Amino acid sequence: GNPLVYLDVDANGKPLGRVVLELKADVVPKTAENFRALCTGEKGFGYKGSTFHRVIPSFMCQAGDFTNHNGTGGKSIYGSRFPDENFTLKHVGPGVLSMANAGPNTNGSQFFICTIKTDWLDGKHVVFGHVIEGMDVVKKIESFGSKSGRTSKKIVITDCGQLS
Numbered sequence: 786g787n788p789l790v791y792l793d794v795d796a797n798g799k800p801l802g803r804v805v806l807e808l809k810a811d812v813v814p815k816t817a818e819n820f821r822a823l824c825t826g827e828k829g830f831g832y833k834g835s836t837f838h839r840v841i842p843s844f845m846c847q848a849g850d851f852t853n854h855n856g857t858g859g860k861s862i863y864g865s866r867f868p869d870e871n872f873t874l875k876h877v878g879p880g881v882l883s884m885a886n887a888g889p890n891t892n893g894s895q896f897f898i899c900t901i902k903t904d905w906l907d908g909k910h911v912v913f914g915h916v917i918e919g920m921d922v923v924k925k926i927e928s929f930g931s932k933s934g935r936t937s938k939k940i941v942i943t944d945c946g947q948l949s
């Protein structure tokens with residue numbers, strides 16, 4: 786079956802809890818594999834210790850820049866960037882997991898979890914999973930965002946990995 790991965794998140798050094806995500810490897814195997822390996826850190830790099838650097842209430846929580854920690858960086862397990870696999874899955878509502886990018890075919894490691902339906906991102910951002918458990922954790926993260934995306938608390942992925 787599809788991988789189940791986790792993110793344990795702190796806000797200002799205190800645990801918020803765990804976000805569990807299903808990666809739709811059946812639809813986007815290459816995008817799901819990249820995220821799965823960055824969670825385990827099995828390639829010698831990944832999300833562990835990185836932050837949610839851009840959070841916009843009533844929109845989304847963005848993370849994954851483990852190289853520059855500011856939204857300009859990140860890298861995939863394949864190389865610096867990889868193509869848009871497909872746009873089959875849509876940004877249907879809260880809990881959608883999707884790839885951040887800098888235009889077509891620029892997927893790296895940055896991703897976002899939506900807190901609303903974001904239909905304008907369909908056909909532009911590759912959706913590759915959804916929140917199974919921990920939407921309460923996502924709402925907490927979201928509450929520490931702002932209109933500019935600047936976070937009011939330091940949001941850190943302390944631990945991450947694969948459940949199944």
Ligand SMILES: O=C(NCc1ccccn1)C(=O)NC1CCCC1
Pocket residue numbers: 845847856857858884885886887893895897910
């Ligand atoms: O912030 C985003 N892209 C900039 C970027 C991403 C990687 C490398 C360099 N520059 C980006 O796609 N955010 C998504 C979250 C909601 C709007 C779309």
